[PDB]
Amino acid sequence: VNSFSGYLKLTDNVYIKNADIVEEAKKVKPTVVVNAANVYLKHGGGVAGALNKATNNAMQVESDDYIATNGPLKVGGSCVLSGHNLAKHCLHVVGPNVNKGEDIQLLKSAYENFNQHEVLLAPLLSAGIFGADPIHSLRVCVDTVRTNVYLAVFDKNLYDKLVSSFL
Ligand SMILES: CC(C)(C)C[C@@H](CO)Nc1ncnc2[nH]ccc12
Ligand SMILES: [Cl-]
């Protein structure tokens, strides 16, 4: 039993809700919140900009030190950093950005990072400003993640389409 509330159950392990991931994180304080990161951990917009703004830029400050030490992530890769005031940890996961010409096949590799964590609050990877089809992202999530994932979908209209079209 966990404190996630109001989710629709899609499969044994995947759950979905129309919600603002920032507000969800602030309410639940999950062990892991997933950020829709880029390889530079530059949190400018979309989910990343929103999560960073909610930390009063502390996520960006921590991320800049991480990159100075380690260099950029790989597309499809991840790193674990602090969750600041939102969660215990933030798993920064880089899905392919179609608007940069990146290989959509890397979306499965990106979701594999979730399997290193028993329970996660997450957005749909590569959706939104990353340019991929959110219906496809949900399918890859369901077919790749085996741990317990709680998906927050910001857009109510898209949420309804994802639910109604879910196989
Ligand atoms: C179409 C969507 C907006 C659902 C695309 C999604 C991509 O992951 N973005 C987000 N998802 C959940 N909470 C969020 N808060 C701020 C941005 C954001
Ligand atoms: Cl977005």
Domain extents in the chain: 8-163
Resolution of this structure in Å: 1.1
The experimental method behind these coordinates is X-ray
- CA of 156 relative to ligand 1 center, distance in Å: 10
Spell out the residues 6+ positions from residue 56 whose beta carbon is closer than 8 angstroms to its own: none
Distances (CA, A) of 51 to 62, 111, 133: 13, 19, 22
List strands edge to edge, sheet with 32-36: 8-9, 14-18, 148-153, 119-122, 32-36, 89-93, 78-82
Q: How many CB atoms lie within 10 A of CB 39?
A: 17
Which residue is closest in CA terms to ligand 1's atom 15? 47
Which CATH number applies to 8-163? 3.40.220.10
